[PDB]
């Protein structure tokens, strides 16, 4: 049985294999949203008589997100201070094809949760929610003039 | 620009060839322009076009078209330029209108006059209309079909397909028109064969010679020329297929087949041939795309260009970089062929799931093929992701249990979760009777398997 912790045999709310945890993360700008869900996910972690259960964490409303990022009227460093002065890690992988705003903002919202497992059972993070339009929009932009 | 105008305006055709040569070395590699000289560029601009009326020299021809090749990658003075008089002048130049190749003299000039063409129909957006309503790719399609087997006409054809790519990229009439009613596709696809020089041993095979000598860079342009305007010619229409086209969407796999398993001059040649390649294999409608196998070696058969494949996408997982624009397609074709013949699928599944012997350590820490994609089924990228998680689920023949035995529960969750399996089942699609495939070791060990990490753990 798999425990829905978040808001086989799958329940809500000692035959516990795995927990699916969900949170939005396009909340960052709510009164915050990302800092509660941060909380419950480090106590639920750090339990005494959980310390051989996995974790999988959804992270959904990836677009959404996107969206306000690149509309430019909220930024995450009036919320996050110590977004200023982050850096990449050094498994990330840089994509030509996007604006870099929103893979530091996905990068930072994984790392956020990350770092409190990494510092035995494991945590999966997971995003959740067109080739043809993929090739198309990459020779539009390499074409070099004459 | 002043010195140059005042002697344009003089008659002599030795004054203004040594004078536009200057100006083309002096600006021969700059991009960036600034508004002050915007009005001494524009009359000089004007003042380009009204000399080549006029009957002079080649070597002032070449000049002149050189100087306005260089001007014309500014957008602000292309407005009081861009009429139709100005644009006859240049297909006439280019011998689109006088389509006659008997003299080697004059293939610099045409070869200038469709650079500038390029620039011009990139830059302006009024020239896509007036070559619309000029009926210019009807006219390339004829110098191409002109230009069947000569010699040293290579860069005439490789700049007559870079004007047909920029032209079926930008508009959607002209593609409509290449595809249908010009007949490109036969005409593409014998180019590719007359570049690959290749002979036919059967009706759908062709004579490999392992030891052969590679390519050319020549041919290598012409090549990714080809393949780059065959993509965006056949674009439009793929989802919509009848039996009278099947003939010639073979031959053009059987043309890729050949195309996958040769080597260019350099690595990076080789590595972009086979990307094109790639791309538009990924066209083709998936029941002509048997004539990759021949009857490295499953059930008898020849199974050389799937190992190129695999070959390339690790030689791609290994760096990191662009997963979006790198990882998708051939991912994509992979799982497609796979998902339609049998053959493929059964050759596939023993080279990149052989039968499991240690369950000591996780199946994402390693450096064997299985252990980089089941690493790429976490990224941040959804479409990665998911094909990556698909292919795998595609060679187990769509059953939970056995994806589950070689990824683990954990690593898996995102796939359950959007095809609405997450508790368990299989797919829709029925292959054949499962047989058993298990190692003596794992028999032991699987009563103390987690299922979720899936590893022997101590």
């Known amino acids: 049985r798999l425990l829905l912790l978040g808001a086989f045999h799958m329940f809500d709310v000692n035959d516990v294999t795995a927990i699916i945890f969900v949170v939005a993360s396009s909340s960052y700008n709510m009164v915050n949203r990302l800092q509660e869900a941060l909380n419950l996910f480090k106590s639920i972690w750090n339990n005494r008589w959980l310390r051989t259960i996995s974790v999988i964490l959804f992270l959904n409303k990836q677009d959404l997100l996107a969206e306000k990022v690149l509309a430019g009227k909220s930024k995450i460093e009036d919320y996050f201070p110590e977004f200023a002065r982050y850096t990449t890690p050094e498994d990330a992988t840089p994509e030509p094809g996007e604006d870099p705003r929103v893979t530091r903002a996905k990068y930072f919202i994984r790392d956020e949760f990350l770092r409190i497992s990494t510092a035995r059972h494991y945590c999966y993070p997971h995003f959740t929610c067109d080739c043809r339009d993929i090739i198309q929009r990459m020779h539009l932009r390499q074409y070099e003039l004459l | ?458």
């Open chain 2, 1 to 458: 620009e002043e010195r140059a105008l005042y002697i344009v305006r003089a008659g002599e055709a030795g004054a203004i060839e040594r004078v536009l040569r200057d100006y083309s070395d002096k600006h021969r590699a700059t991009f960036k322009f600034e508004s002050a000289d915007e009005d001494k560029r524009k009359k000089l601009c004007e003042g380009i076009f009204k000399v080549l009326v006029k009957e002079v020299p080649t070597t002032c021809q070449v000049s002149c078209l050189e100087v306005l090749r260089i001007l014309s990658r500014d957008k602000k003075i292309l407005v009081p330029v861009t009429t139709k008089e100005n644009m006859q002048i240049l297909l006439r130049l280019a011998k689109l209108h006088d389509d006659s190749l008997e003299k080697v003299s004059e293939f610099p000039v045409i070869v200038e006059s469709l650079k500038c063409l390029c620039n011009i129909v990139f830059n302006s957006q009024m020239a896509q209309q007036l070559s619309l309503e000029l009926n210019l790719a009807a006219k390339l399609c004829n110098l191409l079909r002109k230009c069947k087997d000569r010699k040293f006409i290579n860069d005439i054809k490789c700049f007559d397909l870079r004007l047909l790519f920029v032209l079926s990229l930008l508009h959607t009439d002209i593609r409509s028109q290449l595809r249908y009613e010009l007949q490109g596709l036969p005409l593409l696809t014998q180019i590719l064969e007359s570049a690959f020089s290749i002979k036919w041993t059967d009706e759908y095979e062709s004579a490999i010679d392992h030891n052969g000598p590679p390519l050319s860079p020549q041919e290598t342009d012409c090549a990714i020329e080809a393949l780059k305007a065959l993509f965006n010619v056949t674009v439009d229409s793929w989802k919509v297929h009848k039996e009278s086209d099947s003939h010639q969407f073979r031959v053009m796999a059987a043309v890729l087949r050949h195309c996958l398993l040769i080597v260019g001059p350099t690595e990076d040649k080789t590595e972009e041939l086979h990307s094109n390649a790639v791309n538009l294999l990924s066209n083709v409608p998936v029941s002509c795309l048997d004539v990759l196998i021949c009857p490295m070696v499953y059930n008898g058969m020849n199974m050389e260009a799937i190992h190129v494949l695999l070959n390339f996408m690790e030689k791609r997982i290994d760096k990191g970089s662009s997963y979006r624009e790198g990882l998708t397609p051939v991912l994509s074709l992979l799982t497609e062929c796979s998902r339609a013949h049998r053959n493929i699928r059964k050759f596939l599944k023993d080279q990149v799931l052989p039968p499991l012997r240690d369950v000591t350590n996780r199946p994402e820490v390693g450096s064997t093929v299985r252990n980089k994609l089941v690493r790429l089924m976490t990224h941040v990228d959804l479409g990665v992701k998911q094909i990556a998680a698909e292919f795998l689920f595609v060679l187990c023949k769509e059953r939970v249990d056995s994806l589950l035995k070689y990824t683990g529960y954990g690593n898996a969750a995102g796939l359950l979760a959007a095809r609405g399996l997450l508790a368990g089942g299989r797919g829709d699609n029925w292959y054949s009777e499962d047989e058993d495939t298990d190692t003596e070791e794992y028999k032991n060990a699987k009563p103390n398997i987690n299922l979720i990490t899936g590893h022997l753990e101590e």
